[PDB]
Tab-separated table of C-alpha atoms and ligand atoms in Angstrom:
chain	number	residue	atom	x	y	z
M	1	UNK	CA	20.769	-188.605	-79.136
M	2	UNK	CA	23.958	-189.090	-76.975
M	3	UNK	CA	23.694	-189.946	-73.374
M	4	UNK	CA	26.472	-190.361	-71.036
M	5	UNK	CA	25.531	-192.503	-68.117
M	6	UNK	CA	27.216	-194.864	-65.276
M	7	UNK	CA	28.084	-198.009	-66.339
M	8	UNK	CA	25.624	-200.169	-63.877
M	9	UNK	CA	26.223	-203.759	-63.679
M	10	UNK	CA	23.310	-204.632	-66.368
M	11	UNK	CA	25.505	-202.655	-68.657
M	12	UNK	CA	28.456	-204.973	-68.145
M	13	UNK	CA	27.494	-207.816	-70.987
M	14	UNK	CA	26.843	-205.236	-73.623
M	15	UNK	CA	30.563	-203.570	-72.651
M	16	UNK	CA	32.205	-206.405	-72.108
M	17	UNK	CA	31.065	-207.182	-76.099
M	18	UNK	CA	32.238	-203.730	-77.242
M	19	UNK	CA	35.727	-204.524	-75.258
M	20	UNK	CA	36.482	-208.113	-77.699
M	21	UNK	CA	35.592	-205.695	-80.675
M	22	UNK	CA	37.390	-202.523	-79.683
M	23	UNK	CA	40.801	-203.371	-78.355
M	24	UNK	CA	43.538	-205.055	-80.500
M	25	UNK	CA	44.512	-206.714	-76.871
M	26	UNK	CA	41.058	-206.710	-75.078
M	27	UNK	CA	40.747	-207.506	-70.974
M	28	UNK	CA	40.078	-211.068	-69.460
M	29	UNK	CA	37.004	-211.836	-68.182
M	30	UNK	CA	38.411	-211.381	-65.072
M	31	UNK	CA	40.215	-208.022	-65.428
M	32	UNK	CA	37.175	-206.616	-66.638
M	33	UNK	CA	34.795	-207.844	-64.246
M	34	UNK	CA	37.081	-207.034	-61.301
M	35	UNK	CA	37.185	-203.519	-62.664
M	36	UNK	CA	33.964	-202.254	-61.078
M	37	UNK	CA	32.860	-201.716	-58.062
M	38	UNK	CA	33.959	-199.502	-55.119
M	39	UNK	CA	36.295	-196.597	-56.253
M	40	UNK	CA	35.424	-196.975	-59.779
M	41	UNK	CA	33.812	-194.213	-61.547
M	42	UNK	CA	32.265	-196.100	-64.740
M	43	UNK	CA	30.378	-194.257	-67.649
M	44	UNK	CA	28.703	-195.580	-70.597
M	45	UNK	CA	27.784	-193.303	-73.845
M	46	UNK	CA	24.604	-194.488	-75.228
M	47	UNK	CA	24.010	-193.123	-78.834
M	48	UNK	CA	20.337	-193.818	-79.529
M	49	UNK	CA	19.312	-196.736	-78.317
M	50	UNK	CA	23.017	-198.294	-78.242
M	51	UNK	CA	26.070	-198.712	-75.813
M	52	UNK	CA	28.543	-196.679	-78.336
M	53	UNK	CA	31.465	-196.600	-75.588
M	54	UNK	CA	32.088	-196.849	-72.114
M	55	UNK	CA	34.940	-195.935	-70.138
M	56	UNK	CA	36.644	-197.504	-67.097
M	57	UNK	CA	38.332	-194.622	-63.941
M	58	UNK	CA	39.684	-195.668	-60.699
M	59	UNK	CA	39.862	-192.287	-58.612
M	60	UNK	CA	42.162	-192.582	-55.604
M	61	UNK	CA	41.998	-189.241	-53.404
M	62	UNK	CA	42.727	-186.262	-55.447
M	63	UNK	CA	43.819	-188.819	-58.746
M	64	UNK	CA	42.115	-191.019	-61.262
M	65	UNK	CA	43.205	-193.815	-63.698
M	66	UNK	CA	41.670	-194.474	-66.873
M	67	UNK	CA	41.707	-198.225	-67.159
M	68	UNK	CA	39.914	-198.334	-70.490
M	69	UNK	CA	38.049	-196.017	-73.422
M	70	UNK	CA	36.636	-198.237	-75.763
M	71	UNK	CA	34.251	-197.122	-78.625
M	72	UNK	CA	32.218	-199.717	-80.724
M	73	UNK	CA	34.064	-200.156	-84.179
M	74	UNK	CA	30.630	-198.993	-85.940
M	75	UNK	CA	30.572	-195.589	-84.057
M	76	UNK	CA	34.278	-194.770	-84.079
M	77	UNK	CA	35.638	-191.458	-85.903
M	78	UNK	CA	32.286	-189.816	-84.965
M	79	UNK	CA	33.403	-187.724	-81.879
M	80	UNK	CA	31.878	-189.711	-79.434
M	81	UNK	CA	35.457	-190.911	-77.626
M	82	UNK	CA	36.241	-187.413	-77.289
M	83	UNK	CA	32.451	-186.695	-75.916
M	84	UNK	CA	33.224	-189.808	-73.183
M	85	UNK	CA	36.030	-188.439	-71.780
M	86	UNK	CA	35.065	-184.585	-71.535
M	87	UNK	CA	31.908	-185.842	-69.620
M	88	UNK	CA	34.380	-187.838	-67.362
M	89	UNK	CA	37.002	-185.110	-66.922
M	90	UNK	CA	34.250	-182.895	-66.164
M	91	UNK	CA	33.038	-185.429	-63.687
M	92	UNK	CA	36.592	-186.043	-62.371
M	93	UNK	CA	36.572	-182.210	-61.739
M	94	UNK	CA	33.351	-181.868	-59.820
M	95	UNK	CA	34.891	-184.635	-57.607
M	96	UNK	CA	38.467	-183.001	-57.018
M	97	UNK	CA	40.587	-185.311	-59.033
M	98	UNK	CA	43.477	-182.750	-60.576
M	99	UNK	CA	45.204	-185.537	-62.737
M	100	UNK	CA	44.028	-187.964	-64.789
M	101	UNK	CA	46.511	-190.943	-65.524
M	102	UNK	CA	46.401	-193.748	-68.068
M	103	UNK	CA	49.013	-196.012	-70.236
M	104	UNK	CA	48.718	-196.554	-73.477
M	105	UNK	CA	50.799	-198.391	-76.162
M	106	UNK	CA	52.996	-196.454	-78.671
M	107	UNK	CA	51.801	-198.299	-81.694
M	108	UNK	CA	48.439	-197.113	-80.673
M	109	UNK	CA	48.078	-194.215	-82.530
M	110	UNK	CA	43.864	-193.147	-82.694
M	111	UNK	CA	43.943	-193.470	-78.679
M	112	UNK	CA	47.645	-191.251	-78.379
M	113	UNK	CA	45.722	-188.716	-80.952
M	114	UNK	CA	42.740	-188.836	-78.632
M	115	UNK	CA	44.529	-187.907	-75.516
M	116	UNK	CA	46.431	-185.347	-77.282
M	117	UNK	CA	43.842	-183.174	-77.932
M	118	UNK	CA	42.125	-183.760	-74.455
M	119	UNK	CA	45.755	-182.248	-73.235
M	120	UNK	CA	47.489	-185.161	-71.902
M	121	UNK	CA	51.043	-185.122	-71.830
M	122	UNK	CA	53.257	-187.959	-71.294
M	123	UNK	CA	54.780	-188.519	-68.154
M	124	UNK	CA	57.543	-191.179	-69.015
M	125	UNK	CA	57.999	-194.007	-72.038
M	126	UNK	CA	58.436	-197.579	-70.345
M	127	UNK	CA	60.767	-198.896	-72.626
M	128	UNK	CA	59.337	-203.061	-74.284
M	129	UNK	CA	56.632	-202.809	-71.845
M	130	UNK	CA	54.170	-204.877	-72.979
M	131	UNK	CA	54.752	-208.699	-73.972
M	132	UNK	CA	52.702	-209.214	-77.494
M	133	UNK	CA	52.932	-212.051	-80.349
M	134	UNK	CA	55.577	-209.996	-81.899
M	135	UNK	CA	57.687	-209.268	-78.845
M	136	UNK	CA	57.757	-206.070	-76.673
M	137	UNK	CA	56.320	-203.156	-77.074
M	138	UNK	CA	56.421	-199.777	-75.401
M	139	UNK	CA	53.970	-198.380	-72.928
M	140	UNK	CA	53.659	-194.679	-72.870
M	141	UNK	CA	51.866	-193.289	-69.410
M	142	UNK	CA	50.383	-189.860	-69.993
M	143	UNK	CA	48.620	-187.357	-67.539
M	144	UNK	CA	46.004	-185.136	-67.954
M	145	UNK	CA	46.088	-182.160	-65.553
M	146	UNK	CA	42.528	-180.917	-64.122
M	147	UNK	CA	42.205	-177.856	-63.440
M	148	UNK	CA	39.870	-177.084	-60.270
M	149	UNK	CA	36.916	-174.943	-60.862
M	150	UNK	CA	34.049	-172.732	-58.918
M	151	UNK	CA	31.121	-174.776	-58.013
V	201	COA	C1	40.766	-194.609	-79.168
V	201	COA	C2	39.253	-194.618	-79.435
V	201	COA	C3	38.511	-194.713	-78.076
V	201	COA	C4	38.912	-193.287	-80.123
V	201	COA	O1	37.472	-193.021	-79.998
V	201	COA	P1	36.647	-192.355	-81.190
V	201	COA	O2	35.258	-192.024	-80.779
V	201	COA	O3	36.837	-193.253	-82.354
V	201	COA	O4	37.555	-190.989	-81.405
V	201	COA	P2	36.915	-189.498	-81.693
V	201	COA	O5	36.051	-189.641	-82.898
V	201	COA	O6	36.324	-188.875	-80.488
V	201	COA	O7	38.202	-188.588	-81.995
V	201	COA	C5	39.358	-188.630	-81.150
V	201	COA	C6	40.629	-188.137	-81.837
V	201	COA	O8	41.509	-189.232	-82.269
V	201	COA	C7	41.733	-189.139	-83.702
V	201	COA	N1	41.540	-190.516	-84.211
V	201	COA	C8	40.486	-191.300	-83.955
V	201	COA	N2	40.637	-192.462	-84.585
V	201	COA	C9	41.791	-192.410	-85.264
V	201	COA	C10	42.476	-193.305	-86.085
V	201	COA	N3	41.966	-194.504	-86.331
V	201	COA	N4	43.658	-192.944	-86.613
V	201	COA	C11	44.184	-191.745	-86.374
V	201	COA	N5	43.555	-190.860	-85.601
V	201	COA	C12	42.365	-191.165	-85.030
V	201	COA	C13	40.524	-188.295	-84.187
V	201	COA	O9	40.665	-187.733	-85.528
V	201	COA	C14	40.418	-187.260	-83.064
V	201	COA	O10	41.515	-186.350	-83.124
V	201	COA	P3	41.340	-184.971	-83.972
V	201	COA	O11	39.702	-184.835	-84.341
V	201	COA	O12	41.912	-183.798	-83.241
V	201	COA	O13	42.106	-185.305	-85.412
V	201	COA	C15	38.812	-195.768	-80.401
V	201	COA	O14	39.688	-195.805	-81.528
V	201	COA	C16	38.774	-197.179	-79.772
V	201	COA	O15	37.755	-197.600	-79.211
V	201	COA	N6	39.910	-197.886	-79.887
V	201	COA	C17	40.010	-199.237	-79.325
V	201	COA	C18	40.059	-199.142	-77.788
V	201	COA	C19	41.410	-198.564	-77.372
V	201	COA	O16	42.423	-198.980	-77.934
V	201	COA	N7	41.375	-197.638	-76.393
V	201	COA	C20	42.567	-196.922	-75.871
V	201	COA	C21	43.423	-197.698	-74.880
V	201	COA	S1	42.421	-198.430	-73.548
C-alpha cells in the first residue's frame, strides 16, 4: 500500500538517506535541514512499510516551489513520483496555490519527463547555470499552472 503523508521531523533521517541516493548532486546537510519548517509543505510517500519518496514545497501566498522530488533508486520507474506530486498539486490546490515553480537541470532528463506529463511548461532556460565537475550546466525553471476548483 501507498501512503502519502507529511514529512514530520522523525522522517527527516530516513529522507535525508533517500536524498545521497537519489540526486546525482544531492543537498548539504544544511540545505536540507533548513528546508523545513514554517511555510514548507513537506510530504513523504510511504510504500509498505518504506519511505519510497518525499518531496520538498515552499508555498508563498498564492505560489509554491518545489525544492526537491526524490524517489528511492529501488522504487523508481514504478509511478510513485508521479503519485507524489498529484497528491501535492492536489494539496497545493485545496490551499490556493495556482502555480507551482521548480528548476531543474537540462541533462536531467527522468525529472524534465516527469514534469512534462504533470503539465509543466518552462518558463525560461538560464543559460551555464549550475557550476558542476564538468563545468556549467543549464538550469531550466518550469511552472505548473493550478487550476482552482469547487470545494
Ligand atoms: C525524477 C524522479 C523523481 C522520477 O520519479 P519516479 O517515481 O521514478 O517516476 P514515475 O515512475 O512516476 O514516472 C514519471 C515519468 O518520468 C519518466 N521517467 C522516469 N524515469 C525515467 C528515466 N530514468 N528516464 C527517462 N524517463 C523517465 C517516466 O516514464 C514517466 O513518464 P511517462 O510514464 O509519461 O513515460 C526520480 O528519477 C528521482 O528520484 N530522481 C533523482 C531525484 C531528482 O533528480 N529529482 C528531480 C530534481 S529535484
Amino acid at each position: 500500500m501507498n501512503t502519502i503523508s507529511i514529512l514530520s521531523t522523525t522522517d527527516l533521517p530516513a529522507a535525508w538517506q533517500i536524498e545521497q541516493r537519489a540526486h546525482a548532486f544531492p543537498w548539504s546537510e544544511k540545505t536540507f535541514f533548513g528546508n523545513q519548517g514554517e511555510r514548507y509543505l513537506n510530504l513523504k510517500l510511504t510504500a509498505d512499510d518504506r519511505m519510497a519518496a518525499f518531496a520538498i514545497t515552499q508555498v508563498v501566498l498564492d505560489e509554491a516551489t518545489l525544492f526537491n522530488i526524490a524517489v528511492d533508486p529501488d522504487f523508481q520507474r514504478r509511478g510513485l513520483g508521479r503519485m507524489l506530486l498529484e497528491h501535492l498539486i492536489d494539496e497545493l490546490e485545496t490551499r490556493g496555490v495556482v502555480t507551482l515553480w521548480l528548476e531543474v537541470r537540462a541533462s536531467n532528463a527522468a525529472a524534465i519527463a516527469l514534469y512534462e506529463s504533470l503539465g509543466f511548461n518552462e518558463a525560461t532556460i538560464r543559460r551555464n547555470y549550475y557550476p558542476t565537475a564538468q563545468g556549467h550546466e543549464d538550469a531550466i525553471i518550469m511552472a505548473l499552472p493550478i487550476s482552482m476548483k469547487l470545494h
